[PDB]
Amino acid sequence: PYWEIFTPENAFTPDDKEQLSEAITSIYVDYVNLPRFYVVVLFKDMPKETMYVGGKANNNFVRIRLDHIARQMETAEVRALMMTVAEEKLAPFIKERGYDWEIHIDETPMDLWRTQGLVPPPPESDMEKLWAKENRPIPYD
Amino acid sequence: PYWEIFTPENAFTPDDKEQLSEAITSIYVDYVNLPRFYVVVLFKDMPKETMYVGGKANNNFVRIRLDHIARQMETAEVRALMMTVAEEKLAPFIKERGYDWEIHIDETPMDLWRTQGLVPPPPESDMEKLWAKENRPIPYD
Amino acid sequence: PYWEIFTPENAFTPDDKEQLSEAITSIYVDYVNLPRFYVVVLFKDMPKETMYVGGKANNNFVRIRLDHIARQMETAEVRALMMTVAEEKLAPFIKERGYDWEIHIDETPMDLWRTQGLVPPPPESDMEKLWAKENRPIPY
Ligand SMILES: [Mg+2]
DSSP: OEEEEEEETTOSOHHHHHHHHHHHHHHHHHHHOOOGGGOEEEEEEEOTTSEEETTEEOTTEEEEEEEEOSOOOOSHHHHHHHHHHHHHHHTTTTGGGTOEEEEEEEEOOTTSEEETTBOOOOTTOHHHHHHHHHTSOOOOO | OEEEEEEETTOSOHHHHHHHHHHHHHHHHHHHOOOGGGOEEEEEEEOTTSEEETTEEOTTEEEEEEEEOSOOOOSHHHHHHHHHHHHHHHTTTTGGGTOEEEEEEEEOOTTSEEETTBOOOOTTOHHHHHHHHHTSOOOOO | OEEEEEEETTOSOHHHHHHHHHHHHHHHHHHHOOOGGGOEEEEEEEOTTSEEETTEEOTTEEEEEEEEOSOOOOSHHHHHHHHHHHHHHHTTTTGGGTOEEEEEEEEOOTTSEEETTBOOOOTTOHHHHHHHHHTSOOOO
8 A cells, every 4th residue: 555645844753753653553453364574655745835726725635645555445335334444544644634635546557656666465474474473575586 | 527637847836836726627527427436637847958949959948748538529519618717728828928838638438437446437427426526536337 | 558656855866867768769669669769757856755555655766657548459468478577677776775656557548649749650550650650640
């Protein structure tokens, strides 16, 4: 997963970002058994007067966009659950701190993706489980 | 709509950005009566020697990328019209100020999107018309 | 092609960025005769404690994402070749300098794309060849 989180400048401390990125990572570890290192979260500070909503600056706004590469979600129920779980992980840092926020996901081709130069193994394969156990990309054939 | 506009550092004043984001919002309001707050425009300043076109730094270049989430464009005619209107709104700020520029759009899944933790209502629904009237996301069932 | 390259602060000098974007550009020029100016590379410096991998800051990490707009890659072999050649161009600047790195591609619709306000010509068309030779969008 590839997460971008656009925030007001200095909204989050390093400890905040660690805790939030840990919560996001736990989504994929708990629900999909993904290797932890698949989960990338990029925090991007946005100065005042750079984020515009409906033609007006919103300096109290967190905008989230992510790509899902590793898996495709095939049912309405699973797709709704992903959005629900995402909101649960985010709420302590965003909603409950008074920010406005919005989030969307795109699904991108699994075969156009490399990590440390390696082709990630098939979903739910024994090799994927090994990558998850050691939490690193291990060369294989 | 989710717009990213990468510009040279200090290309636009806060007033420029408000006027441009307003022009962008008007595309969607005028043609379909979309809720205004669906339209997000993110301005990102890029310092010199960070944007490379054909292998050479171009410090006079505005690159625009957007996601369409709320609606799909189903005919060639509508898709061409969208690009035409986009160029019209952009021209006073970009082309006419001597910038080089390029723009593209991706369409992403409508059902993997939440605003203020809420599921946006169906297109052309009474609830969508209410969201547009109040220009706020209102909880519903 | 639309490339975003996220790096640790001050990882690359202007000369580094010039050479790397030239290498990336050579992919499309050499293999498909794409117009050079189609290839855009954006470098984004990321300060310490802004890139998190598996819940921990990785301050030694280069993340690459690109969109392919102009054409689609229709076979497994071509799609694999693209990733292989990309890794080859990147290695002298990233892998060989000791960074961790990751890359992925999305394919976006050809007909929702304009450059200098113009409709790009059809792939492999006579007009595309003129755009490539002059390396600029020629009204037509
Ligand atoms: Mg896409």
